Design a protein around this ligand. Structure first.
Ligand SMILES: Cc1cc2nc3c(=O)[nH]c(=O)nc-3n(C[C@H](O)[C@H](O)[C@H](O)COP(=O)(O)O)c2cc1C
Lengths: 337, 338
């Protein structure tokens, strides 16, 4: 016996939604409550985990509501909380009971506020919250991750020369492209550090980490020729570093400020392979360890030993640079002056 | 007139005296509102003419029986009042046995409980903004002059290699706890943690603050080391600190998918590098000419010559001298860990 609680973003159709959920939840044996307030849903679903989930999956696929977040989960509950309500839909906008108006006010406010904060949250925290887990309570673990670093090439020159607002548009589009792909491929972005994107994949995701990289590179290449030469995006290039090692993962800091962080040498090895791509005919570089997390039959190029005790460095064929790198930063420089 | 809304964490019978005196001090100041108590948390709405409910809001910020106050919403120049008949209506939901409101009491308690956890992950700047009533996601980034602060643990990769996981965590949490406390005490903002590094910034008028922050960090780690026993890893906790001063863009960046608050500019790289430099120097603080120009206090500045990172003149203050040498600390750190 389990129970989840989620919030999402969305009159007669609502009634239809409700009638159908009572009959199926009556069949499935799970009971719950559903609340609607000013474009916001809340829903609790409790029972045998079997189709708590399967019901949930159907809810996720449905097109009406959107931006679904599972706020909490609970396993092994001695009791149910709503034992006789297959689904009790509560439209709260027309409940104008006086001593209830204050609570609707607070619920709306903290919720909308909540949904803003959700945008700043590291994706591993948001994940933990789905699984019903207090990220403040999880003990950090030591895990073998693939670590991903990428930044924008010659970013000090674009900053030196573009107006501030062009610089934002450029970074924003870089982070947008980087996040979507990394996320699509199973990865998790840890944070932005300046222009740099940091992320990590599991050890079963070697192939996805290379594909991710290759997709970033490729998407920025397409953007460069889709825009006009007056567009700064025309100048956006990246380099990508990947390492593989053990890292303490988890939530750290104090009650005053927390962060989700990875600690370990491999983080720094990845940063410096990223920085090394500036001197190489490839925009992606990575270690023997990443090489071993891969199942696809890549064509691996030994780039040689680089110190950072020395570490052998590898890339794949598909990452060859069709350009000369330090020529580009001379390109960027001329262009912007 | 105005309307504001906040949560706080508490720090039965005196709950309702807060009721009593607000219910009595408020209306004479001509304000209305509601006070909700739920599981150690307070939510309040306070509505009146603008100058009066500000003076009340501040007498409340410093009121000693709650803490972790966040003002969520701030409405200006309201047309009417939400609770015109309530000088201040107190409501304690813990004791609303009625199951009928229990679904919405259960969803209010879940959400805010979540909210207060997400708060602890936010950039301090966006918590600042929410308290000022500005929506953080619609502030356009500005190019501003800041002092950039970086600090990190000395020989941390040797710690990570010889301590067990839980001990490293204890060590890192304590170091962040201290850093964040003092940076925030002095008016800086932590911008993020990166591995073991603390990254913060101060305004141009906070140069002495940025130095004193740095010396206070260093001083606290020094007391901790001798306060604890030799089997306690905190006994081996050291830091180095780098300060730069430069133009940086400070704004919300990312995509609807992920957003961050951050700073772009060379000053960031300059300060991280200066910090990496302190390992090579007799001093645990290092900073640039520009930082130094932001200081008004009469410090004894010490010039450590130029350093390529074009070259950078580097300064410290005498108070920052290490009573140790820095390569032994590395080998001492290593030997102690059997
Ligand atoms: C959660 C909470 C809400 C409060 N709300 C009010 C309020 O609405 N109005 C008010 O005058 N005081 C409020 N107070 C605190 C009192 O004003 C405080 O005791 C104050 O020192 C009394 O004012 P006085 O010293 O001028 O007599 C609140 C305190 C708490 C903890």
């Amino acid at each position: 016996m389990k129970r989840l609680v989620y919030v999402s973003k969305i009159l007669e159709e609502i009634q239809r939604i409700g009638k159908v959920s009572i009959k199926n939840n009556q069949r499935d044996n799970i009971t719950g409550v559903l609340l609607y307030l000013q474009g916001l849903f809340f829903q609790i679903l409790e029972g045998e985990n079997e189709k708590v989930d399967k019901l949930y999956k159907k809810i996720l696929v449905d097109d009406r509501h959107t931006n679904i977040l599972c706020l909490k989960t609970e396993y092994d509950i001695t009791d149910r909380m709503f034992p006789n309500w297959a689904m009790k839909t509560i439209n709260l906008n027309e409940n104008s009971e006086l001593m209830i108006q204050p609570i609707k006010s607070l619920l709306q406010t903290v919720t909308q506020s909540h949904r803003v904060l959700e945008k700043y949250m590291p994706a591993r925290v948001i994940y933990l919250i789905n699984q019903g887990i207090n990220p403040l309570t999880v003990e950090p673990q030591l895990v073998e991750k693939i670590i991903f670093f990428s930044d924008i090439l010659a970013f000090s020159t674009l900053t030196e020369k573009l107006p501030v607002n062009e610089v934002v548009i450029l970074v924003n589009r870089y982070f947008s492209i980087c996040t979507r792909i990394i996320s699509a491929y199973g990865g998790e972005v840890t944070k932005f550090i300046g222009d740099c994107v940091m992320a990590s994949f599991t050890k079963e995701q070697g192939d996805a980490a290379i594909r991710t990289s290759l997709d970033i590179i490729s998407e920025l290449k397409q953007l460069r020729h889709h825009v006009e030469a007056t567009n700064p995006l025309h100048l956006l290039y990246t380099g990508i570093g990947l390492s593989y090692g053990h890292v303490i993962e988890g939530n750290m800091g104090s009650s005053l400020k927390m962060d989700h962080t990875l600690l370990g040498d491999a983080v720094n090895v990845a940063a410096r392979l990223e920085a090394l791509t500036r001197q190489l005919p490839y925009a992606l570089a990575f270690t023997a360890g990443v090489k071993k997390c891969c199942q696809a039959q890549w064509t691996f190029i030994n780039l040689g030993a680089h110190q950072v005790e020395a570490i052998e460095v590898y890339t794949v064929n598909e990452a060859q640079k069709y350009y000369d790198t330090l020529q580009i930063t001379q390109l960027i420089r001329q262009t912007l002056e």
